């Protein structure tokens, strides 16, 4: 009999069984049977300029570490919006209906990189 | 698994369509009729049994068509004939002496005078003489010729009473219908079909007939020459 514990890959089947190995698709099938590759589907690697970047893969051994303080939503809010909203309330122009000036986003569907749908891979 | 039928074709065409035979198997997959399967590959030629069928509804009067070719059909024992009228052609069941280059009339008009019955002509039963040989007769007006179609077989008109025609089938049974039922005149083609001789047991396999079972069965009371009287006349007129 055949084997059941081994993985069922494309190498173990007939000619008509061609299963992918996990890569993402990059296009579709055109008119004359060929493959039309879409340049918007291929990932564009955004590489920065490492010329004047003074940072190495390792750090100094004598450099001190820090206590583990995982960044939280409350800490991020206190760092980015608490001073602005506090100053606005002290000045007396606070508007509870409009919070877009402090960084809040009502709907994610407007901008490019939304957070809940996660339109960006990485 | 349940299989699908090959008869999924709504559009009528003159070109032969491919058909998938099935030997006695129903849509489940079990044998329902024994002795069927393993014949010759055949195509299906769609036959138009409603003879009086005008092209457009604007002119519903009688029409004449021309016979192009009388061809062989593996699906039925008769011969088919291509008839063209207007912008379309159609397959019909050729009569005994229908040849290429004939004219066939298709009429639905009934008059006080009987018409001269040719072969390819198709008139309602109310317009044919009292002793006319017919074939491809109908049960209801516009239903289609379910009755006599086989090669050489033909029925006979007996009488017309109260606007209802009585015919006699090849089984010597009487069939009463309305007089407005269209019927083709004459005998069906291939009158020598019963005289054919299967030369060998392989011709039956060619036709698609598997051999009978080898089990010996003792005859019961059903066997024997049962001389039964002729059944009553089958009437299709709906009397209110």
């Amino acid at each position: 009999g055949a084997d059941r514990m081994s993985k069922w890959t494309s190498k173990r089947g007939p000619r008509t069984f061609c299963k992918g190995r996990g890569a993402k698709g990059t296009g579709f099938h055109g008119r004359d049977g060929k493959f039309v590759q879409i340049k918007e589907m291929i990932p564009e690697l955004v590489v920065p300029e490492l010329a004047g970047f003074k940072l190495k893969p390792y750090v100094n051994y004598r450099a001190p570490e820090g206590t583990d303080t995982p960044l939280t939503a409350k800490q991020l809010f206190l760092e980015t919006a608490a001073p602005a909203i506090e100053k606005d309330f002290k000045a007396g122009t606070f508007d509870p209906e409009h919070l877009e000036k402090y960084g809040f986003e009502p709907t994610q569907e407007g901008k490019l990189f939304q957070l809940y749908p996660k339109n960006f891979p990485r | 698994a349940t299989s699908v039928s090959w008869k999924s074709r709504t559009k009528y065409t003159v070109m032969p369509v491919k058909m998938r035979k099935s030997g006695g198997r129903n849509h489940t997959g079990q044998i329902q009729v024994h002795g069927i399967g393993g014949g010759h590959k055949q195509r299906y030629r769609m036959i138009d049994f409603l003879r009086f069928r005008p092209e457009h509804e604007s002119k519903p009067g009688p029409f004449e068509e021309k016979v192009i070719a009388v061809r062989y059909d593996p699906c039925r024992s008769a011969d088919i004939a291509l008839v063209a009228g207007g912008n379309r052609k159609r397959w019909i069941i050729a009569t005994e002496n229908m040849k290429a280059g004939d004219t066939v009339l298709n009429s639905d008009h009934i008059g006080r005078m009987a018409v001269a019955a040719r072969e390819g002509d198709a008139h309602p039963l109310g317009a044919l003489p009292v002793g006319t040989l017919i074939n491809n007769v109908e049960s209801e007006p516009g239903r289609g010729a379910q009755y006599i179609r086989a090669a050489g077989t033909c029925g006979v008109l007996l009488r017309k009473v109260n606007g209802t025609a009585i015919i006699q089938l090849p089984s010597k049974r009487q069939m009463q219908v309305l007089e407005t039922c269209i019927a083709t005149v004459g005998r069906v083609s291939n009158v020598d079909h019963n005289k054919r001789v299967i030369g060998k047991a392989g011709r039956n396999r060619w036709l698609g007939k598997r051999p009978n079972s080898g089990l010996w069965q003792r005859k019961g009371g059903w066997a024997g020459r049962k001389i039964r009287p002729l059944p009553p006349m089958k009437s299709y007129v709906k009397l209110p």
């Binding site: 009999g1 055949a2 059941r4 514990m5 173990r12 089947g13 007939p14 069984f17 | -």
Partner: protein, 46 residues
């Protein structure tokens, strides 16, 4: 004549007769998978 070689391998027939989809398409195959899961089988189907 000579027996013993009744198994002729073919992946199409294997996966169509004892595959995961074949087991899950019927309520009895779902019971088969549930029984194999209760026993703790490493391989539930082919």
């Amino acid at each position: 004549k000579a027996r013993g070689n009744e198994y002729q391998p073919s992946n199409i027939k294997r996966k169509h007769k004892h595959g995961w989809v074949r087991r899950l398409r019927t309520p009895t195959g779902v019971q088969v998978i549930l029984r194999r899961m209760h026993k703790g089988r490493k391989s539930l189907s082919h």
